Write a protein that binds this ligand. Structure first.
Ligand SMILES: OC[C@H]1O[C@@H](O)[C@H](O)[C@@H](O)[C@H]1O
Ligand SMILES: C[N+](C)(C)CCOP(=O)(O)O
Ligand SMILES: [Cl-]
Length: 137
């Protein structure tokens, strides 16, 4: 089926400290050419509520560009009817302190349709990814 999703950690190195600017932790690309109503990311496990979890026991908040956070529902969502693959990124807010360790994210992605118009889930995939933060000496 034409539904597809790519959840990948960012290739570039991340450095421990107060992040100098917005830094992408993960890249998320999902799409379908044939009809649907929208898309959502439901964080799972210890990612509950939009969080990366460190091997030091720290949660760090993830933010989105394309989608919008609904905490009442614990999901990022975006409503769009179009074939164009959605280019979205999970990132950390500037000034966010990162520690030189391994940050994990688990979730599941869902696709839907509106009739009428309340969410019916057409597809799901379980995304996950990790990013290991380097150090500045
Ligand atoms: O486009 C409808 C959306 O409404 C939001 O409130 C909800 O959190 C999403 O899961 C989705 O149902
Ligand atoms: C934005 N969030 C509520 C999903 C995560 C929390 O972010 P922050 O409290 O780490 O800034
Ligand atoms: Cl957000």
């Amino acid at each position: 089926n034409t539904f597809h999703v790519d959840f990948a950690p960012n290739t570039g190195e991340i450095f421990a400290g107060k992040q100098p600017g917005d830094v992408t932790m993960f890249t998320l690309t999902m799409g379908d050419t044939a009809p649907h109503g929208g898309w959502r990311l439901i964080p799972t496990g210890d990612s509950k509520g939009g969080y990366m979890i460190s091997a030091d026991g720290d949660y760090v908040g993830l933010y989105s560009y394309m989608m919008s956070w609904v905490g009442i529902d614990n999901n990022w969502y975006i409503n769009d009817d179009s074939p164009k693959d959605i280019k979205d990124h999970l990132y950390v807010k500037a000034g966010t302190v990162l520690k030189p360790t391994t940050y994990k994210f688990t979730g599941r992605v869902e696709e839907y349709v509106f009739d009428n118009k309340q969410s019916t889930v057409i597809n799901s995939k379980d995304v996950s990814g990790e990013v290991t933060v380097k150090q500045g000496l």
